[PDB]
């Protein structure tokens, strides 16, 4: 009757999400800037369970080990205050202009190098604040033309970059594991490893894969136009959904970070249905940015609709795969058989199967329908609480 | 002085691209069908080097094993006659309706053991034809709505059918390797395995990777917004650009499969320099329809245009990259420190050089330009043959 | 309690769209020939209103005279028996491969006077059916090459075709209007007015401007990645909606056509609010193809969800408007305001208004929040029948 | 031999162009300020013809009465050394935070009656200068959500807004055109008018509907997937293009503001053979942002690149259009014919004409090739220098 967050939920939210000015490529700040200590504290108060932040959102680029330890102890004590956790955390790599054409893969040797040393310096903080998930989005890898970019040598270069920081969190028994984010462009024309498939494929040539996964974004998948619940099943197929970032996203265009349940509704639907299927036991960490039009209790009633569009839509997913209509509808459709083996007797026994090719009635085969407009009906009926 | 093909230049063609119809989902064909023997005596005197097929383009549908052995023997009289290779075949499992749910990855298991039996038997007439590539599409494998397939599930079956066929043709002794072919929609609403990077991570997770790599399209990766020549990158570092289809798409839309050099001309240009400086050894196919306003005349016109375009974008990419003035502007950006790696000195090394973090200064290395302008325009001047 | 479509609620299927055999550009049809008389009857029991039709779909192509005559009476009578309307016709200009390039802009101006004189036939027809609104999708209108077709003389020649037709109707005394549809892409690479906004301002220029609008599709305009009710909010504000074709889509790719509901449900939802609310009357139409997974069974389903999720939504909007915690968050977003005149008091009050930019507080006004996430949460409440 | 731009071609430039800082929604400016004297300086000695303006580029927002005379002598003296030219100028009406929500559709109708005395203060100083164009961009106007703005009510007060600047130039007596400048979305969700037809259909409802024509930019048309060629094709056969912006864009994604000749190359070509054809005689504007990679020489690189791509295609279009075998290749494929009246013998004898109907041989007719890929390929050619 109530579809009131708890902390047992486990959601969670970026620093920079509804601490997010306004600043947008054609317009100037909306909203003063949020001091962390107070975002902390009106998270827990909506039901948040953690928040995450990249270096530069809790320490100001340039500080002094002396300010540094200042802005770690007052955030410390808002976390002790409020039993918020930090379960992820992540480097700024994009914003100062050192980082204009990259951090790990810039064409200087230099930037490079000290991109790699702001980072283990701040994986060194994430653990001693309990983060067990240390993300990477490369948001300035990447190029806008042909020939500023060696792609072969990028890869290299991004490949020594993060076995560098396996051998690191290894060297230094950390227990923390890697989380690559994708994103196909924005802000720079083409970023490298644009998909949630081309990060799982670069990670298998990683000196220690194991201690790396993905941290794909609703919207990112989509300014490609792919179905975001179809990568999060390949991604948990892999083994590799590590952490997860939720948000709308309204189609091919600019990374419009909405909260989570605007943009594609129904894709929202069956990526809830997927992830409390499989299990899925991470945060649920929204990256998002509440619109530049709204004030502050605009932020918060942005940031509050994420988690409440959560827990509605996981409702109707288990509404859904509890209906014993839905239950027949799905076995109409045959998907007891999709879950069964093609050939577990064996290829030996496939090739002399006749009832397999010989003897097989394909025209049969042909008119049986799938029913699959009933199956998706009855989830609309039960997205919409039509049932009926 | 001339941009004509030889077959050393290693073109070839599918038999269902000049011999496409003109079918579309809004109209009939426009062409008579084409006999395939008499596709390969005109691509060979346009300069092909070879031709591939489906079973299907090859042996209609349905055939007796005595029709069978005659369409076959015609065509392989005309391979005799006129000196053409048949490097790669693949097999249809889209055009018939028992495959409208998918070959591999249908929910029916009868099917999927027929899609199976279908491809086996054409794996053993490509290696007779001597063809070294088995390429796949899975151009059914996917869904239209959310709740009919789960895509856990339909990744084992596609696992099972990709190890099943390693298993054939290692019991066999064949020297043959297989080659999937990404596309991120149509004609189903989402396709498995939608772009190089989901091909190549899922590659990864077969019993025996190394008979497994891509064949990627231009037009298909293209219809996810996605850089072409930066996948084709990812491909070559991972080992495995076994073969490619070249042709042209505008854009995020219908595929379209223009002819090559037609769609993104720039795109283009990077490909070639790409395959050209890497030495992609393989076919240079193309999968294009001549558009289906052409006559007879217009489909060879079109057939020539794709070679003629490749060529002359491969004699402009060797001039840019022997042009002195281009080799000090790659320079002048840093390409050459790209290719160094960042740590060779290792990792305590970089945790100990000050010049790294310390003392490093950020505002100088930030105000340095990239100089990239100036190289594109370079690399433009020479696309255009306006040097200058 | 019951989402029960009667035909008092106006809605209409065109005949190809259960009739949709499935054939796809790369597949067979799965499904036989319906016979139009019994899609008439069964679209009756779901509880539809009317049909359309192109002539092509009642009337085979070549046919006599006489069976001609024979179709239509058929057709008449299964009108006659179930009450079922005709509010809606229009010409196949697309199927033929006569119409490859064009039918009023094909190059050859024999094709463009055989293209007039089918589209006139048809007029006949329709009116002797009582079809109020006469459709024109130029689907082969457009081009995929920029040398084929020079666009200021298509528009030419496509002006000239409506002023015929508009000649043609005024001078027989018929009171039918005319309606353009348009579309971006697909079959032709580029479409001659590829959006509602080019059909309205083509319109202008037409001699009798009056007797044309648009024939807006959800799909279409979402294929450029539009938002449809803001173009249908354009067509009713120009007084130009005289029809609307009703289906799903899902982003910028192919044409998918799928039922209403499917796709973009919010688009959907906010679609529906501005019809009901604008008291648009004309049909609610849809064109929309059963996936060709299905059989018949599946074809009636769909055809049945289109209508089904049509009411749904418009039970939701009315509840969102009639919901006073909504009227009160209209009030507190200001689309009251929206609603006012910006300077009812004239140009020289505006000028002489210090309080309009002499004493404007600009700090002041900038720092009113537009609270219009908190609404958007209470539009998504509502659709989700989650209040709350 | 040289691609030399002289003040004759009429090339311009936007100040916040070479003067864009390089702050995108990801990271801080890599630049530093440019003072508009110095651009004006650095653009004359390129061979620009002239520059454009905001408002708020100029004059910095706030300025007292004293401030801003200051500003405009030391430009105008500029101006007067370097007899450069002030084509167009426009309001910045979206980098204010009060403009949040839009200047002219804002919900809040103070702002709206500031944004048009913001406007018209600077259509003062517009005339003055000697501009002969005012752009209006309405970047804010749109919404993210779809209770946010009822775009009826924000269509009648955008019509109230245009109509009221139209009564203040005719009433001052100025000869100043205004052009409306499309986008599709970016910075808002959804902008209002926001492809060239949808501008050019809401200017047919202005009360002194002569006063206002387009200025449609190349990346903005290709931000939804369209043909800016064709757009332009019908902004010209309606008489409104007013002025024009050139770019490069790749593709459906974020606006990326690249050097005119970069992203789409063949469109480029297209459209300038389109532009020198039609006799466009207006400026040469380009609204492009050199890369936030580049210093101040790259800058200066990519402004000079713009105007040598112009003058490059438009060398390639002319040699197109004089060569006598593409004019040979234009009637082939009955370009000729186009160009004709469907049915300068009017209606009735169109109805009477047998040979458009009743003895029309359509198999004939649709087995006519239309030549487009023979004339593609001259025209492929052509652009790379490669006749042949
Ligand atoms: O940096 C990690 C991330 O998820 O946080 C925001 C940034 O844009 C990226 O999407
Ligand atoms: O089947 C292999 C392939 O490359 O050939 C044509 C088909 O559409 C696919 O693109
Ligand atoms: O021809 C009118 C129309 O609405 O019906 C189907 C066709 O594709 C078009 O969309
Ligand atoms: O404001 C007019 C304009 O052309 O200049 C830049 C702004 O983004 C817009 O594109």
């Given at each position: 009757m109530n579809y009131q967050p708890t902390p047992e939920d486990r959601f969670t939210f970026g620093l920079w999400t509804v601490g997010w000015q306004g600043r947008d490529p054609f317009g100037d700040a909306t909203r003063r800037a949020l001091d962390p200590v107070e975002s902390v504290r009106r998270l827990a108060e909506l039901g948040a369970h953690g928040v995450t932040f990249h270096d530069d959102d809790l320490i100001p680029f340039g500080s002094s080990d002396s300010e540094r330890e200042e802005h770690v102890k007052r955030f410390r004590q808002a976390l002790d205050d409020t039993g918020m956790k930090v379960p992820m955390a992540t480097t700024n790599l994009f914003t100062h202009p050192v980082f204009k054409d990259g951090g790990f893969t810039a064409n200087d040797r230099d930037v490079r190098r000290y991109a790699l040393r702001k980072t283990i310096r701040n994986i060194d903080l994430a653990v001693e604040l309990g983060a067990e998930t240390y993300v990477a989005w490369g948001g300035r890898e990447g190029a806008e033309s042909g020939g500023a970019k060696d792609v072969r040598d990028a890869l290299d270069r991004m490949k020594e970059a993060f076995d560098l920081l396996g051998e690191y969190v290894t060297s230094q028994g950390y227990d923390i594991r890697f989380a690559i984010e994708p994103k196909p462009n924005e802000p720079r024309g083409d970023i490298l490893l644009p998909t949630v498939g081309h990060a799982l494929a670069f990670i298998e040539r990683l000196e220690r894969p194991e201690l790396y996964g993905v941290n794909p974004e609703v919207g990112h998948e989509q300014m490609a136009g792919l179905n975001f619940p179809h990568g999060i099943a390949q991604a948990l197929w892999a083994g590799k959904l590590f952490h997860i970032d939720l948000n709308g996203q309204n189609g091919?265009?600019?990374?419009?970070?909405?909260?989570?349940?605007?943009?594609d509704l129904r894709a929202a639907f069956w990526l809830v249905d997927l992830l409390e299927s499989a299990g899925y036991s991470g945060p649920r960490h929204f990256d998002f940015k509440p619109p530049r039009t709204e004030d502050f209790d605009g932020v918060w009633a942005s940031a509050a609709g994420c988690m409440r569009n959560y827990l509605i839509l996981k409702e109707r997913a288990a509404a859904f795969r509890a209906d014993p209509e839905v239950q027949e509808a799905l076995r109409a459709s045959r998907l007891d058989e999709l879950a069964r083996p093609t050939a577990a007797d064996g290829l030996q026994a496939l090739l002399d199967d006749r009832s397999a090719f010989e003897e097989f009635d394909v025209d049969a085969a042909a008119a049986r329908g799938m029913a699959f407009e009933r199956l998706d009906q009855l989830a609309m009926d039960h997205l919409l609480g039509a049932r009926g």
């Open positions: 091919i265009k600019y990374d419009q970070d909405l909260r989570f349940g605007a943009g």
